[PDB]
Write a protein that binds this ligand. Structure first.
Ligand code: HEC
Length: 103
């Protein structure tokens, strides 16, 4: 898991819609501070869809790796409109960074 390459991905692919830092604003999507170890649909102040709220699983390495490959198949109904990151190595690196930058 390479945190410098995952950071590049994030800025490329996610940053338009998300922030990571403590305090960080909700943009199109929620801020993601806290996210590991949290159940889905849990960032304070954000209005999620009832899908992302009710999925009910906890965000950890394994589940973030599955969700990122295809977000709409994992959360049918999500308003996170983004196709996925298909390649396993870029997903690892990108998970390895979120881990770092969200606590
Ligand atoms: C804007 C077009 C987005 C892009 C680009 C990415 N995401 Fe996103 N995301 C967006 C929204 C509107 C939402 C809420 C979904 C809903 O159904 O309510 C989200 C949500 C997430 C979540 C879930 C947060 C929760 O607390 O469970 C995560 C973990 C997440 N998004 C991660 C993420 C990453 C890593 C992205 C880059 C590849 C990414 N998102 C892109 C909108 C958009």
């Amino acid at each position: 898991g390479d945190v410098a390459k995952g950071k590049k991905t994030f800025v490329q692919k996610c940053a338009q819609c998300h922030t990571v830092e403590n305090g960080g604003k909700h943009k199109v999507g929620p801020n993601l501070w806290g996210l590991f170890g949290r159940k889905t649909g849990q960032a304070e102040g954000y209005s999620y869809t009832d899908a992302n709220k009710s999925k009910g699983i906890v965000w950890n390495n394994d589940t973030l790796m599955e969700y990122l490959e295809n977000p709409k198949k994992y959360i049918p109904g999500t308003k996170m409109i983004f196709a996925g990151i298909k390649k396993k190595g870029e997903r690892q690196d990108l998970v390895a960074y979120l881990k770092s930058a969200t606590s």
